[PDB]
Curated annotation (Swiss-Prot), chains A, B, C, D, E, F:
The chain holds residues 73 to 255 of 270 of the full protein. This is Imidazoleglycerol-phosphate dehydratase 1, chloroplastic. It is an enzyme of class 4 (lyase). Mn(2+) 2 binds at residues 64, 68, 136, 161. Substrate binds at residues 12, 38-46, 64-68, 90, 112, 160-168. Binds 2 manganese ions per subunit. The keyword Ubl conjugation does not apply. GO terms for molecular function: imidazoleglycerol-phosphate dehydratase activity; metal ion binding. Keywords: Acetylation, Amino-acid biosynthesis, Chloroplast, Histidine biosynthesis, Lyase, Manganese, Metal-binding, Plastid, Transit peptide. The lineage of its organism: Eukaryota, Viridiplantae, Streptophyta, Embryophyta, Tracheophyta. Mn(2+) 1 binds at residues 38, 65, 160, 164. Its EC number is 4.2.1.19. The gene is HISN5A. Its cofactor is Mn(2+). It comes from Arabidopsis thaliana (Mouse-ear cress). Pathway: Amino-acid biosynthesis; L-histidine biosynthesis; L-histidine from 5-phospho-alpha-D-ribose 1-diphosphate: step 6/9.
Length: 183, 183, 183, 183, 183, 183
């Protein structure tokens, strides 16, 4: 059905991205960022999107540049994939937990970008992943997607659980919005 | 489908209300209060109700009497159309964003009226519509409706957005509650 | 020279914007919001932009929708105008007083939208204009324009003064950024 | 160039002044207040004005009378020199440091007098110059001048450095404002 | 044009630095510190300096010794290149954004060294680069450069952004001060 | 007797004002601002001045420009009426109540502009009149008038009473100051 394909090439990065909204949950990501792939594999698995990401970047500097241009790419792919937005639910709201974590995501494929981020992560790094990037990821994805997106933390100690549960609750909500409403 | 109709006159106002719970979203409000029409036009447009309102009132004094009497009629009209309540969900739950605002609405078509209203609207006026009247509209609605309704502000700065996001949220939660569940 | 043009027709509004970055100071704005027109003439007179707005919207409900759609147009007109963005300054920075008022605007034409708004206006209305719409004007303008924009209140009592000083500093920095850098 | 000339004679003082907006840097000031001459020399040197001041007053009493009248004359001759204020930038904004001091100066040759003075000088006397008189010089300069002026201390420990940096940033921004703009 | 060159060899590092004040933005750094190279390309890119750096040091202990010997060299390369300092602006002042961040950077090539540094970086590492070394870099660069330099943070969450914004504003203000004034 | 006339035309207003310092209390104000007319009527009546105002302004936008330009015209009209200021009290000082309110005006015809304004008016509008304009009227009057005016709210709840009592007190002390002293 609905597939979005973007190939962006900056000085800093090389990003190839393919999203099927009406997928079966196929996860095939290789960004050079081990933890970000794991989050994108959740995105596929939990909202049954098919996600094909393939990137190569400044990883020697920071993770910052690659994190960002993948995120911007995914949002542009999301926009092309929704087409003219004919009869989709459009809104989606799901609270998913992971053990002690409990994350709430409400969103709306509005056309006007906004990221409400209320998410305190107590450690500065999960694996090698700078933990400030999760915010940056979602910001960049929202800015090209045109997606109004609030994310709210109700509970959580463990930083791995917190980001995983967020991506779990973002996927299930995103599907809810991409699916077709019997209008 | 399921339709409730109410004529209702007093010394102060004259009010007439036709509501289709199984409509297509035909918004048809002319109350003498431009702002309230707009919110009633979102009730229809998001809940897929057909909403017909016609009214004249003491607007030259206050919007108070007309906002209250319309609200009272709509709840009475909602009550008739629901009729026997045969096999409906009864409960609706929906959080809705409109940019920075984020409003949760939980309801239960119970028979016992309750408004839990937790909404701080920073400005006294949106257009020419007294901002205190958003609480009096849902309070009057609930009173004739036999509805149990909680409205909770989670986020919000701008007044238009907040009120509108409540009406968006409430409409999709009313729809959910009036629909038939494979019981 | 560099001219962006935008027509835009939504259910609510009918907007027609035309902006010349290399103008002479031509203000020709009639939107049906008298206050916004006066501000859009500060934009022209101080940025030496030629500005031509023409709009009709739901003024009877609110100024909100008309405010919003003009802003989204002005921001789009800007992005057509800039085109390739070759050999321009890219960064603006100007602090501007108007009597007791003092407003710092810093901007970067980056292709990534951000609003930093630290402006407490002590009255709900100047003329008939809802004061919350000043923020929504720059927010919506930024959202299509692709502009990183910080606005900073350093001083101000009079609400007319604060908004006017804002459009003065914005305009002069918009100029600094849009002009050619001897590269 | 543009030359202001003002000879004014109270009971208390005999002031003579000649400023040249389009000067070259010609420091020529004797006032009977050695520190103020050191500040007037910085005004000519950093703004590239040709400043000429010659004064006598009740110095045996206080530096007050003489400080005020010189300030009142410099303002007036600034005005006479501007004339019709045709084609000039008009606005000036500059932040100059001196060692640990850092003072920001925004002004506007506006026709309307105003002084915001946010400047804590920790000592009561630099040499023999009463430290309260710095405020009084820019206050009196501003009334006759019709200038809008904000002086903001962002850093500073040493009293000499604070005042001199204030005279440096005043100078450089005043230049900006008197300079022609290609309209 | 104005070129400074420096080879500085210690028991710890071998540092080679050529700087071109009147360049076209030539970036060319390999210091063994990936993030410092990125900040150097930003300096070369935004001041239109040409920046050639080559370094080998204790990167296996710390990044500290390399960080400091490189920046001490760069200050010295700046000082040779500047010469007698004839008819340059001397004062450079610029506030620059990078998304949520906003750093103001006022300086004066005075001959007397000073660093007012008011920057709170919320993480301890960008990439593998100690976040404390940013201050020490600007501190060393100031000591031999004979420069007066204030760096004020007005906003910022993301560390990468904060520092890159510091380097963007440092660059555009150094440009301003080394450029020639029509005197 | 002592008569001051002024015609002043801007791009926003057309103001004509005449004031007789030795009048008999004749009130002749049509300003486009019904509340300020009422305040000038008190100004004549309570100081026995003959006040003639006829104005035309942006009133569709704001009352701002019209309020300011009338204020500035009265001050120039006052300065002229006074001429060479020979044999007159110079200093006035009156405290006038209006019911619960109590204002203390204490002026000085100093040729030196200052306003002390220590008034807290608890509502945003008296009629259609923006309450902020009271300060701005008096600020603008003082700037072109060369008067030293202190306004002290000692008591007051109702805003109509506070502004009217200010104009009462202000008039009785302007009258006192302009009267002659057996010299
Ligand atoms: Mn009543
Ligand atoms: Mn009631
Ligand atoms: Mn709306
Ligand atoms: Mn909006
Ligand atoms: Mn004295
Ligand atoms: Mn004095
Ligand atoms: Mn060290
Ligand atoms: Mn970034
Ligand atoms: Mn970077
Ligand atoms: Mn204005
Ligand atoms: Mn004004
Ligand atoms: Mn009265």
């Amino acid at each position: 059905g609905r597939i979005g394909e973007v190939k962006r090439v900056t000085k800093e990065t090389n990003v190839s991205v393919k999203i099927n909204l009406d997928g079966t949950g196929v996860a095939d990501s290789s960004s050079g960022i081990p933890f970000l792939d794991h989050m994108l594999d959740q995105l596929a698995s939990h909202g049954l999107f098919d996600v094909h990401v393939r990137a190569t970047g400044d990883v020697h500097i920071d993770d910052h540049h690659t994190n960002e241009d993948i995120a911007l790419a995914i949002g542009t792919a999301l926009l092309k994939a929704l087409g003219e937005r004919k009869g989709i639910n459009r809104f989606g709201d799901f609270t998913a937990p992971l053990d002690e974590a409990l994350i709430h995501v409400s969103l709306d494929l509005s056309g006007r970008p906004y990221l409400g981020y209320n998410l305190e992560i107590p450690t500065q790094r999960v694996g090698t992943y700078d933990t400030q990037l999760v915010e940056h990821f979602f910001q960049s994805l929202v800015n090209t997607s045109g997606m109004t997106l609030h994310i709210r933390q109700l509970a959580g100690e463990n930083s791995h659980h917190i980001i995983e549960a967020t991506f779990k609750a973002f996927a299930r909500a995103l599907r809810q919005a991409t699916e077709t409403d019997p209008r």
